[PDB]
Write a structure and sequence with these properties.
2 domains, two-stranded antiparallel sheet, about 30% helix, binds S-adenosyl-L-homocysteine, binds magnesium ion, transferase, gentamicin methyltransferase, monomeric, Putative gentamicin methyltransferase
């Protein structure tokens, strides 16, 4: 079972983590793999060779944080390292649904894609709902005065704190809780890589939590959003006969009465035997004329061709 490892970033001092993060950044994804890169690829490594790379303190920090485990003759890691969009990120390896622990963290299934979709503006307060590994928080860090990540998974929170510290990000904070409960005040930016996929209405687990998690999210968005602010959501949507997702969404948001503008960019579609349709897409709330617009934009298709073409 994968996703139950103990993660304790508070056990390493801030400078030491940041230095580790710098060491990771120069080797993870390098064409010339070092012990550190091997470690973060899931390969057992010689601790002595590791020690030559990150020093004795770096070695101990790996252990104390839970980033490495002493097998006996080797170190290995339960985590996998990634470098993207200027940050390093550790998360769980990508594994089949049946072997995922309750507290398994999104292995970056879509994050790299979503960051390419994200608007480039900055502002005062940003909120990353269901922050997981923390990845979307990390890239918001340099253009927002503060970033808050929330997750109900306590291991995700620990992992996000770790990743923020690896990247030296002072203005990035994480709270454990249920949706908006720990998120005080309003935010100029709210991002949500929602735990919705194939489960429809029903809760399966923390990564497929059902449509009610979207209803909770959008019902509360207007009271958590700074006017003029921006909301971005990766989500699965179900259209049923006489019951399209977009009309449930408009109701949750109080779209007309609040005068909000919503754009849904639908990338993937699959008709269902109901006569309905499953969709995956990208939803944006942003200033503009009141209303909801849905356009078909195969950005997954584009991303497969050239990721840089969503730039
Ligand atoms: C944070 N939002 C996410 C959302 O991005 C979405 O991610 C999808 C993944 O789940 C899916 O992975 C599946 O195929 C993998 C490899 N064969 C297996 O290892 C695993 C298995 N799940 C990807 N192939 C495609 C993604 N679009 O759905 C998540 C809930 O399932 C949801 O939490
Ligand atoms: N009640 C709720 N409150 C906070 N987050 C929740 C939740 N139910 C699920 N989540 C979290 O939503 C996250 C979705 S996974 C996405 C993680 C990260 N933002 C990324 O883009 O890679 C999971 O970590 C899951 O634990
Ligand atoms: Mg699951």
């Amino acid at each position: 079972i994968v996703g139950g490892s103990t993660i304790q970033p508070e056990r390493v001092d801030a400078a030491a983590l940041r230095q580790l993060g710098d060491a990771m950044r120069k080797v993870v994804g390098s064409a010339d793999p070092t012990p550190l890169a091997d470690l973060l690829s899931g390969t057992p490594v010689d601790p002595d060779e590791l020690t030559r790379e990150v020093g004795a303190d770096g070695r101990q920090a790996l252990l104390d944080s839970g980033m490495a485990v002493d097998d006996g003759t080797t170190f290995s890691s339960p985590l996998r390292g990634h470098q993207l969009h200027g940050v390093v990120v550790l998360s769980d390896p990508d594994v089949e649904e049946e072997v995922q622990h309750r507290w398994y963290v999104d292995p970056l299934w879509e994050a790299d894609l979503l960051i390419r979709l994200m608007l480039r503006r900055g502002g005062a307060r940003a909120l990353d709902m269901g922050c997981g590994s923390g990845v979307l928080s990390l890239v918001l860090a340099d253009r927002y005065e503060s970033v808050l990540g929330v997750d109900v998974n306590p291991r995700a929170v620990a992992l996000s704190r770790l990743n923020a510290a690896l990247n030296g990000l002072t203005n990035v904070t994480f709270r454990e809780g249920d949706m908006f409960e720990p998120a005080e005040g309003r935010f100029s930016r709210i991002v949500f890589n929602s735990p919705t996929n194939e489960e429809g209405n029903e809760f399966v687990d923390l990564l497929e939590a059902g449509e009610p998690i979207l209803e909770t999210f959008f019902r509360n968005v207007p009271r958590k959003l700074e006017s003029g602010g921006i909301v971005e959501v990766n989500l699965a949507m179900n259209d049923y006969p006489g019951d399209p997702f977009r009309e449930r969404l408009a109701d949750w948001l109080g779209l007309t009465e609040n005068g909000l503008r919503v754009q849904i960019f639908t990338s993937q579609r699959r008709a269902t035997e109901s006569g309905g349709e499953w969709k995956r897409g990208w939803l944006v709330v942003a200033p503009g004329p009141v209303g909801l617009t849905e356009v078909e934009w195969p950005y997954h298709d584009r991303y497969e061709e050239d990721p840089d073409a969503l730039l």
